[PDB]
Ligand binder design. Structure first.
Ligand SMILES: COc1ccc(CCN(C)CCC[C@](C#N)(c2ccc(OC)c(OC)c2)C(C)C)cc1OC
Ligand SMILES: Nc1ncnc2c1ncn2[C@@H]1O[C@H](COP(=O)(O)OP(=O)(O)OP(=O)(O)O)[C@@H](O)[C@H]1O
Ligand SMILES: Nc1ncnc2c1ncn2[C@@H]1O[C@H](COP(=O)(O)OP(=O)(O)OP(=O)(O)O)[C@@H](O)[C@H]1O
Ligand SMILES: [Mg+2]
Ligand SMILES: [Mg+2]
Length: 1151
């Protein structure tokens, strides 16, 4: 039940604030009783009073000042306590996440963890900021009203109490519905948001395969579900509002039943009865307004329990534990015996079944194994990402548990086969790798990393920008950057995986030699697949089924007739904003008629009540006037019923219009994004997170800017006009004070509601950066844990959140001050109006009834306008967001992907002709990669591409897929211009596989079927693809078969498995022309020959392009082309290339 246990001074401050709120709530019935007594005194006088009026005004002013001071103090204390608690909870959660083990992170989805940390924290802040204080004040006011009624009212008090519970329940329901709107909207739209985020994550592959139809259908279904949920919520809110409105009419009808009882009633005059009724109404309103705190108490308790459970997950392996010891004389020595471990996703499968391995300091040790032999698993185990199920792994003869992952990973840096990076500058990545580099270690790593051409020629050598996940950077460039970053860290246990054997082997000799420069000062384990690299390795160890079989020098392995020998032998405005008229044309007017009706509801009742007040005055008029009072009460009840009906109708119409507009806008935005140039997405402005936030936080802004804005404006204008007309007609002198106080009162009312939406929006805007940092740390938590950078990340997050904490505290203080000022202004205005009415009554300028009616009408109009403005959103920054949205819809891309204009060829001959083709990237158009190269390819021809890293082969392949356009030259397919052909049709027929393909985090079968878009992918196609790629056996070996779930970035499979899956999907796509980038890679080279050779069987009848460092794969190619700085030095048969002493000949000789 209790969740607060820190900052006992904070608890005392909260208690003081609650006491002040209760005092104000109790005083409110005191003000009601004072008003009733003043009314009774005026009625008695009408049947000297200046001194009494002045004394009452002074007492009211003092009471209002005290109430305002107490309310301000309570609000400020509650806001400060809520902010401090939120900050402390966020810090504790960050610390727990940093201390959280790798297993916990693997078990719980990182995206789900971030979503929880955001949503639960926001809900706790919303439900603990002002809800408790408001509930306490409402309860105190209700108790004071009940106490006052018990001693004053007798039968009237009993009737008021009996009628109270229905109105209290209605107000409670209305408050609960109004308070928790985000929980209903964002929760429903979370599915659509996640779908959009997933689509944006692999938009590149989606455009490559043209699978926009499925994404559009899913988005449409999610939008329809969200619209249905919103319509239901709006209907419920309208019903609650109608019930609340009818409650006032019912209460008025019940009160009017007195009649013959006269003002005397039991023992008091009409003033006492009116005061009792007002106190009962105030108590019922407070009870209704105290409900939301209790209603959200359950959600707050659930969020607090979840946060505590996450924080209270103290694991055995703690990064902040002081029980361990930090090793200093860490000599290079590793020993693993009977090492057995199983992944958590598939516990049944045991990749490692024990083995004996020993590595000495300053010794280059390489591991060679079959497909999925456990090389990546062994590297991960060495990095301490997981734990050993059985066996014993020690470093320097000491158990790993002695120094924990803390001292294990913090001293050894490793690079994965496909290292991840951040969309920032290269210098930023270097600094992230090591903060204390001082520009010396970075320079040394750059010199050793052999990365000069890319850094030098490209602009901003130390500030060169890289897209998401280093998309702009080349695969070889990315590998070189990762190697340099690892070297800069100055690690003692180097871990090399797929250094440069990705695209061309020519760079491999340049890279491996560099690795030989510094390979004796510390232990180094590398995963080599080339013959030269394997031979250069000091020691090579053979693994099979997770068991070490061979271990020794290259000569020993060759003479042992082991797996290495077999592998070697095998190798050999309104117009732009009011766009709802298409669907809202026959409904908006229906709402408008309601809005005007609402404008008439506020003043009309103000008059009717006034007509009652005068009827209740002058000794309740004569006996004949009783029928007039009854008629006035009946008219007021009818007007209230009509107003409730009109409000319900207007709310339903507004909700329907808003839902329709939001759905249409979302559909248009999705269509525009799908039919957009690929180059547009490759820019810092089109960030995945920023784009998702803009897309999600658009419906509410547009709705509030158009529909709610118009409704509020119309209602306020109508109310103000009606009030002014009534005051002028029935007011001569008192109208001046009402007009003077109108603007301040209206502003206070507009800023009189909860206004939590603005505070939440400001907090989200401030903490967007902190959330992005947290997401980056969680997604790449493995990299941070490897370098033991948890403390630095936590410090950075705290520093970034500190400013938002101060801004939120200042905003809360400002809001509390504004609320206190509004309350004090209302209290003083009441006394001023009473004094003005008394002064007017003293003279013959106007009667008491007219002045009272004018004052009541003015006050009611101002309060209604303020409440409508505060509750209903109005002009704000949302309009600006609309400018960012509409321009997106109206924007047209350079290439009309959606447009069907395109020549339809009779048949596909699989012929490509490029001549003098020159292309330049959009981000860096001053550094072109092509100088007018040419290439001819015929049907059923196998072409291989080689050359220096980043020579343009990948760029040429991308251009072939119509990803971009050439600055100059000519590109034709089967003697036909590519630009004059369908883009989607051409892409669907192109089997393009990138160096780092993206696999959706879903079932393997679903991912495979997604390759063949616009057609049904039966299980037979998947089986055939697996057989072609030899993946059926692997799928059967793994649990769930094709139903196995895929985690983030394919966490359930290795790089080789992902490459095989991508190849199988491309084959299933039935591509007339196929292209692969870094298809071979390490990927268990021995297994690759099994798959690659199979491709040769399927290569018949189609043109295939393969780029890889291995010479064996290129040998089978019909033609081989070498590109040097975008220029094809030579092209022809393998024998011709071998005869010529070119780049290819030199590479072959080196290998
Ligand atoms: C509708 O019938 C009426 C009932 C009471 C009163 C005035 C009674 N006086 C003691 C002043 C109290 C002001 C009052 C309270 N409590 C109040 C004012 C502003 C508020 O913030 C929006 C509020 O909410 C807590 C309550 C309510 C009557 C509106 C006027 C009325 O006519 C408008
Ligand atoms: N997190 C995981 N959950 C389940 N299975 C996994 C996970 N990581 C890897 N695997 C699978 O377990 C086996 C581990 O193979 P490992 O990656 O260690 O060897 P490898 O020869 O270096 O791999 P590759 O050439 O595919 O990169 C492979 O089948 C891999 O698909
Ligand atoms: N979107 C991009 N914006 C700017 N420069 C880019 C972009 N994509 C690639 N580059 C640059 O173009 C060159 C990439 O060359 P290319 O795409 O032809 O690859 P490659 O030589 O086949 O091999 P790899 O797979 O290693 O990139 C590198 O200079 C890279 O920095
Ligand atoms: Mg591997
Ligand atoms: Mg490439």
């Amino acid at each position: 039940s209790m969740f607060r246990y820190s900052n006992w001074l904070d608890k005392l401050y909260m208690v003081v604030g609650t006491l002040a709120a209760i005092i104000h709530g109790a005083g409110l019935p005191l003000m009601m009783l004072v008003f009733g007594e003043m009314t009774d005194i005026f009625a008695n006088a009408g049947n000297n009073l200046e001194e009494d009026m002045t004394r009452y005004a002074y007492y009211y002013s003092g009471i209002g000042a005290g109430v305002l001071v107490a309310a301000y103090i309570q609000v400020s204390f509650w806001c400060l306590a809520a902010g401090r608690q939120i900050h402390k909870i966020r810090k504790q959660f960050f610390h727990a996440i940093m201390r959280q083990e790798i297993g916990w992170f693997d078990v719980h989805d990182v995206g789900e963890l971030n979503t929880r940390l955001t949503d639960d924290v926001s809900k706790i802040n919303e439900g603990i900021g002002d809800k408790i204080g408001m509930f306490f004040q409402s309860m105190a006011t209700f108790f004071t009203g009940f106490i006052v009624g018990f001693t004053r009212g007798w039968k009237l008090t009993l009737v008021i109490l009996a009628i109270s519970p229905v109105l209290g329940l209605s107000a409670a329901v209305w408050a609960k519905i109004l308070s928790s709107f985000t929980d209903k909207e964002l929760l429903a739209y979370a599915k659509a948001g996640a779908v959009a985020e997933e689509v944006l994550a692999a938009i590149r592959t989606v455009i490559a395969f043209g699978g926009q139809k499925k994404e559009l259908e899913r988005y449409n279904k999610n939008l329809e579900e969200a619209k249905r949920i919103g319509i239901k919520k709006a209907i419920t809110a309208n019903i609650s509002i109608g019930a609340a409105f009818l409650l006032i009419y019912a209460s008025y009808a019940l009160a009017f039943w007195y009649g013959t009882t006269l003002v005397l009633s039991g023992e008091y005059s009409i003033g006492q009865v009116l005061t009792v009724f007002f106190s009962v109404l105030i108590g019922a309103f407070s009870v209704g307004q105290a409900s939301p705190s209790i209603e959200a108490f359950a959600n707050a308790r659930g969020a607090a329990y979840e946060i505590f459970k996450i924080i209270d997950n103290k694991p055995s392996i703690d990064s902040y534990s002081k029980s361990g010891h930090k090793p200093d004389n860490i000599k290079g020595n590793l020993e693993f015996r009977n090492v057995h471990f199983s992944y958590p996703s598939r516990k049944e499968v045991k990749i490692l079944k024990g083995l004996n391995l020993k590595v000495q300091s300053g010794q280059t040790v390489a591991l060679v194994g079959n497909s999925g032999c456990g090389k990546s698993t062994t590297v991960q185990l060495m990095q301490r990402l997981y734990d050993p199920t059985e066996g014993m792994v020690s470093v320097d003869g000491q158990d790993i548990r002695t120094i924990n992952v803390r001292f294990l990973r913090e001293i050894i840096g490793v690079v994965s086969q496909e290292p991840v990076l951040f969309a920032t500058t290269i210098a930023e990545n270097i600094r992230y790798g090591r903060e204390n580099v001082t520009m010396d270690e970075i320079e040394k790593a750059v010199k050793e990393a052999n990365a000069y051409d890319f850094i030098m020629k490209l602009p901003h050598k130390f500030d060169t920008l890289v897209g998401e996940r280093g998309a702009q950077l080349s695969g070889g460039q990315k590998q070189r950057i990762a190697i340099a970053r690892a070297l800069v860290r100055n690690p003692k246990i180097l871990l090399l995986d797929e250094a440069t054997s990705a695209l061309d082997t020519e760079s491999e000799a340049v890279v491996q030699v560099a690795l030989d420069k510094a390979r004796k000062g510390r232990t180094t384990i590398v995963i080599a697949h080339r013959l030269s690299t394997v031979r250069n390795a000091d020691v090579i160890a053979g693994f099979d089924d997770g068991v070490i079989v061979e271990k020794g020098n290259h000569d020993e392995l060759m003479k042992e007739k082991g797996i290495y020998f077999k592998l070697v032998t095998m190798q050999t405005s309104f117009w732009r904003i009011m766009k709802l008229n298409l669907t809202e044309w026959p409904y908006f007017v229906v709402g408008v008629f309601c809005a005007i009706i609402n404008g008439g509801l506020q003043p009309a009742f103000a008059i009717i009540f006034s007509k009652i007040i005068g009827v209740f005055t002058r000794i309740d008029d004569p006996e004949t006037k009783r029928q007039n009072s009854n008629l006035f009460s009946l008219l007021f009840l009818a007007l209230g019923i009509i107003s409730f009906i009109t409000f319900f109708l207007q709310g339903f119409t507004f909700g329907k219009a808003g839902e329709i507009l939001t759905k249409r806008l979302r559909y248009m935005v999705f269509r525009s994004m799908l039919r957009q140039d690929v180059s547009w997405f490759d820019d810092p402005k089109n960030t995945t997170g920023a784009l998702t936030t803009r897309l999600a936080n658009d419906a509410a802004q547009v709705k509030g800017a158009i529909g709610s804005r118009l409704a509020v404006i119309t209602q306020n204008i109508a109310n103000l006009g009606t009030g002014i007309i009534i005051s002028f007609i029935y007011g001569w002198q008192l109208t001046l004070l009402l007009l003077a106080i109108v603007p301040i009162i209206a502003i206070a009312g507009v800023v009189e509601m909860k206004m939590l939406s603005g505070q939440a929006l400001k907090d989200k805007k401030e903490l967007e950066g902190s959330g992005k940092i947290a997401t980056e740390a969680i997604e790449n938590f493995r990299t941070v844990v490897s370098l033991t950078q948890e403390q630095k990340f936590e410090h950075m997050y705290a520093q970034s959140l500190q400013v938002p904490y101060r801004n939120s505290l200042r905003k809360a203080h400002i809001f509390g001050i504004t609320f206190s000022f509004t309350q004090a202004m209302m209290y003083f205005s009441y006394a001023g109006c009473f004094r003005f009415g008394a002064y007017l009554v003293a003279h013959k300028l106007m009667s008491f009834e007219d002045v009272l009616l004018v004052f009541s009408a003015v006050v009611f109009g101002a309060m209604a306008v303020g409440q409508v403005s505060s509750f209903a959103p109005d002009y704000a920054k949302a309009k600006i967001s609309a400018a960012h949205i509409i321009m997106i819809i109206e924007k047209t891309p350079l290439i009309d992907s959606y447009s069907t204009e395109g020549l339809m060829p009779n048949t596909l001959e699989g012929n490509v002709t490029f001549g003098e083709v020159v292309f330049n990237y959009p981000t860096r158009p001053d550094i072109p990669v092509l100088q007018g190269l040419s290439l001819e390819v015929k049907k059923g021809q196998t072409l291989a591409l080689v050359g220096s890293s980043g020579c343009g082969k990948s760029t040429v392949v991308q251009l072939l897929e119509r990803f971009y356009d050439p600055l100059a030259g000519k590109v034709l397919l089967d003697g036909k211009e590519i630009k004059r052909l369908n883009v989607q049709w051409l892409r669907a027929h192109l089997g393009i596989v990138s160096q780092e393909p993206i696999l959706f985090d879903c079932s393997i079968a679903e991912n495979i079927a997604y390759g063949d878009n616009s057609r049904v992918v039966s299980q037979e196609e998947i089986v055939r693809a697996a057989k072609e790629a030899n993946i059926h056996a692997f799928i059967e070996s793994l649990p769930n078969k094709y139903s196995t779930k895929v985690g983030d970035k394919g966490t359930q499979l290795s790089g080789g498995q992902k490459q095989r899956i991508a190849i199988a999907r491309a084959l299933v796509r039935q591509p007339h022309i196929l292209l692969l980038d870094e298809a071979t890679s390490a990927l268990d080279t021995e297994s690759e020959k099994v798959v690659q050779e199979a491709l040769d069987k399927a290569r018949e009848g189609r043109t295939c392009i393969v780029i890889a460092h291995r010479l064996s794969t290129i040998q089978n190619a019909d033609l081989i082309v070498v590109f040097q700085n975008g220029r094809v030095k030579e092209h022809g048969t393998h024998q011709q290339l071998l005869a010529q002493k070119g780049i290819y000949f030199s590479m072959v000789s080196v290998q």
